[PDB]
Amino acid sequence: MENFQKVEKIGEGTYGVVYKARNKLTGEVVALKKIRSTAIREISLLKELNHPNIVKLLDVIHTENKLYLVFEFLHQDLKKFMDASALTGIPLPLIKSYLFQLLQGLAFCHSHRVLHRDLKPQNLLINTEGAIKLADFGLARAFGVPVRTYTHEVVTLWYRAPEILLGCKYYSTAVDIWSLGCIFAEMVTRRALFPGDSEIDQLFRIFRTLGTPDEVVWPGVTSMPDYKPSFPKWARQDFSKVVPPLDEDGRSLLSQMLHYDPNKRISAKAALAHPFFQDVTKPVPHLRL
């Protein structure tokens, strides 16, 4: 656009290129996404769902075969922070604060019947004040999640809920709770929980750890579109081996976020009340920009 002076290319989204840009009339520093009627309607609605833990959508510009999304700018993402902290780990008080803030953002969006559907460390942004925000919220409802991005990069399957993998057509808010639990486990262990490299590999990795689901733990599972009776029958592993050395409060919360049945899986609202959050504080991270 004419009103923006581009400083640099900052990344590649699922849909388009992301630039760091400066507004010419306001001097405001923003993140500018360049993409490529019903989709425009859905995205215009996103200008109203404002929360401190949701990246602000400042403006929507549709012109000459392009869709421009003007976003609030944050200096770092959780993926790079996790990589930079790989040797010593992220301290437990910070993991806790980040999880607490993320659950607040989810509780707000879910209360307005808006789900993310594609949470990953790459779309979780952080600042020097100890804040963490969810980016790209609502874009999956508007365009759907493709197999590959606009650059042909493979879209990650690692944080995908089992009901999605099993062919359900109606996703609930429980899908975001699953992804966030996978992220929680990764911050604690410094390794991906379920690093699948295909839909079947992802599903069988979930099954190997949590046990192959049945009509006992998940009513209706055997009737789901992509369910096969030929699926190998794996035993559930003990949670103490899943995320060591996380305490019992953390392990209890993680087990509830990873329930197979989307109706049994803890809500963002109920997660905020879990005893794990009794001693939450707001520490600041050690970022060098």
Ligand SMILES: CCCC(=O)Nc1n[nH]c2c(F)c(F)c(-c3ccccc3)cc12
């Ligand atoms: C090192 C982080 C620098 C950065 O890109 N900051 C950003 N500031 N604001 C942003 C934003 F609103 C975004 F939507 C994305 C984004 C993230 C993942 C996938 C697609 C888009 C990134 C940023």
